[PDB]
Design a protein around this nucleic acid. Structure first.
Ligand SMILES: [Mg+2]
Ligand SMILES: [Mn+2]
Ligand SMILES: [Mn+2]
Length: 430
DNA sequence: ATTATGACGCT
DNA sequence: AGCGTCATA
């Protein structure tokens, strides 16, 4: 009864930019605004590979991973922006720098966890307590929540979408008990008020729109965020979880989109997150391991304890290039030239990082893929990173991979390399 | 011939 | 350490 922990102690948000690389290009080039458009890398093979798609273009069925030539078949007027190429490779610097713009604004409200190039988690628990105490037990007006959806509402005893949003929000606000500063639903609501302010700040100061989820933990916040994209935010309350999860495919929950999620489905013969509640913690641990089992047992009840880590900066800096089909590297001079290209971009990014962030990387990881290999990486080797010098880093990388060459001849490289990867890791303050 | 990343888990 | 999983533009 009184001891049943409910995963209501925190207020957590996830803020995720809408169509992020597309918005970065639309800010730069006004001709692309409010149009079906996509961001592409490379051009020569099938028009290039799409990595971001505006919502206008999604209406035509354009998706990520699509070749631009194929996307053009669905959407003949599709506009395209190309990722920068430097030193023979795609260069994502413009988007990394746009990410920093957003992360710095978010950091003004609370400590954030950078979760990708375009999203961060926010622990709003403390901020919510402070806003609650200056609120003086005064009700929260719908006007403070102009882009907020309350998941699961309206319900019970208008055919426009905004009309439905407000009806749900009205039901929610009508039910609230603003008299209780410890009420989780109230805390989430004030959390949502703060996230409206955060999202307004991001749009004002960068031009970029975003969506957000507000709940009691990271997994629910992430799930919530996607429910009403673009340019809206969604509150998923603890009470909303049973209905939400009753028809929620297991794969939709973060970390269950791959082999583990498939195994949950196959082994237990279920489809939806809610169905997990009928297994004991020990049953789930028996199939999926101690850690996953306990996590699943709590997660299907809406409960998760993973903290929002205080980390705003990436903890690795890497450079990678595929060499597909007939472009695979088959000579020593080829392999060395591309290690140099990668190492030169890595040095540029590392030196910037050292100046900006007062740290130095101490380990260099080198990874390659060989033709025929089923996997992402065929081989990974580390060595010391002692100087921010591209020629040394590329020479060192070659030394660690030198023996992968199976050719008797040393001038040729076999089997040909289909991927090179340089990653700087193990930072120390400097 | 999706590509370029980046975090974290396992042994 | 090196490998595997899962994730996002
Ligand atoms: Mg996406
Ligand atoms: Mn996004
Ligand atoms: Mn994202």
């Amino acid at each position: 009864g009184p001891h049943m922990a409910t995963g209501q102690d925190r207020v957590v948000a996830l803020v995720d930019m809408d169509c992020f690389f597309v918005q970065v290009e639309q800010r730069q080039n006004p001709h692309l605004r409010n149009k079906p458009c996509a961001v592409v890398q490379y051009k020569s093979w099938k028009g290039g590979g799409i990595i971001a798609v505006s919502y206008e273009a999604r209406a035509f069925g354009v998706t990520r991973s699509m070749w631009a030539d194929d996307a053009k078949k669905l959407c003949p007027d599709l506009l395209l922006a190309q990722v920068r190429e430097s030193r023979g490779k795609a260069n994502l610097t413009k988007y990394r720098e746009a990410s920093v713009e957003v992360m710095e604004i978010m950091s003004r409200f609370a400590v954030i966890e950078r979760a990708s190039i375009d999203e961060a988690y926010v622990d709003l628990t403390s901020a919510v307590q402070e806003r609650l105490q200056k609120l003086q037990g005064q009700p929260i007006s719908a006007d403070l929540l102009p882009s907020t959806y309350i998941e699961g509402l309206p319900q019970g005893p208008t055919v426009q979408k905004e009309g439905m949003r407000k009806q749900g929000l009205f039901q929610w606000l009508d039910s609230l008990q603003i008299d209780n500063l410890t009420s989780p639903d109230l805390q989430l609501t004030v959390g949502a008020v703060i996230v409206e302010e955060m999202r307004a700040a991001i749009e004002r100061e960068t031009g970029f729109q975003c969506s957000a989820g507000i709940s009691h933990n990271k997994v629910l916040a992430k799930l919530a965020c996607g429910l009403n994209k673009p340019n809206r935010q969604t509150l998923v309350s603890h009470g909303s979880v049973p209905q939400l999860f009753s028809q929620m495919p297991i794969r939709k929950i973060r970390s269950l989109g791959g082999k583990l999620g498939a195994s949950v489905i196959e082994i237990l013969g279920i489809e939806y997150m809610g169905e997990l509640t009928q297994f004991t913690e020990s049953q789930l641990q028996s199939h999926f391991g101690e850690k996953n089992g306990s996590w699943l047992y709590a997660m299907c009840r809406g409960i998760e304890h993973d903290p929002v880590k205080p980390r705003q900066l990436p903890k690795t800096i890497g450079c990678s290039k595929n060499f597909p089909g007939k472009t695979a590297l088959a000579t020593r001079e080829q392999v060395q030239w591309w290690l140099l290209q990668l190492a030169q971009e890595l040095e540029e990014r590392l030196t910037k990082d050292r100046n900006d962030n007062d740290r130095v990387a101490t380990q260099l990881v080198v990874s390659i893929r060989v033709q025929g290999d089923k996997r992402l990486s065929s081989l990974r080797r580390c060595c010391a990173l002692t100087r921010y010098d591209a020629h040394k880093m590329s020479h060192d990388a070659f030394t660690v991979i030198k023996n992968c060459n199976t050719s008797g001849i040393q001038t040729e490289w076999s089997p040909p390399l289909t991927m090179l990867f340089l990653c700087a890791t193990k930072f120390s303050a400097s």
